[PDB]
Amino acid sequence: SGAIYVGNYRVVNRHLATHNDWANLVWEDSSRDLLVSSTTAQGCDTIARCDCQTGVYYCSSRRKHYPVSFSKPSLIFVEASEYYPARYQSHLMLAVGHSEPGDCGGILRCQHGVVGIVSTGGNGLVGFADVRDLLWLDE
Ligand SMILES: COc1cccc(Cl)c1NC(=O)N1CC[C@H](C(N)=O)C1
Ligand SMILES: [Zn+2]
Structure with a gap:
């Protein structure tokens, strides 16, 4: 497990994305195993x-x-x-x-x-x- 928190985005492995990641979807690419979702708090x-x-x-x-x-x-x-x-x-x-x-x-x-x-x-x-x-x- 693990994620990158940058600005108002959370970047995770697409195969580990949660129901919340999919409900706040920005972009996903199965060929890259990446998914990016939106966040309310500013990232670290x-x-x-x-x-x-x-x-x-x-x-x-x-x-x-x-x-x-x-x-x-x-x-x-x-x-x-x-x-x-x-x-x-x-x-x-x-x-x-x-x-x-x-x-x-x-x-x-x-x-x-x-x-x-x-x-x-x-x-x-x-x-x-x-x-x-x-x-x-x-x-
Ligand atoms: C760190 O990953 C591994 C480590 C050791 C053995 C193995 Cl089979 C793996 N691979 C995996 O578990 N996966 C799950 C999906 C992921 C993908 N991007 O397709 C590959
Ligand atoms: Zn460098």
């Missing part, structure tokens, strides 16, 4: 606008943060799960790092701010859904 986070490929993510299954090197956002095949059929997920960045299903939502950050959230993983890999291209989150 800042979004990076950069091309960093190193950062630090929070791993809830270890209660620890880990440094990572990650690929540029791209279209990557993701195996079928209880939430989606087998498909290509876009704007996804992969890294070598520990992750378990419940780790989805952990924030990845570089020195400029929030880069994305954990969205995929397995066998010593961790994948993050990029949010740096969503310029409207800050406007």
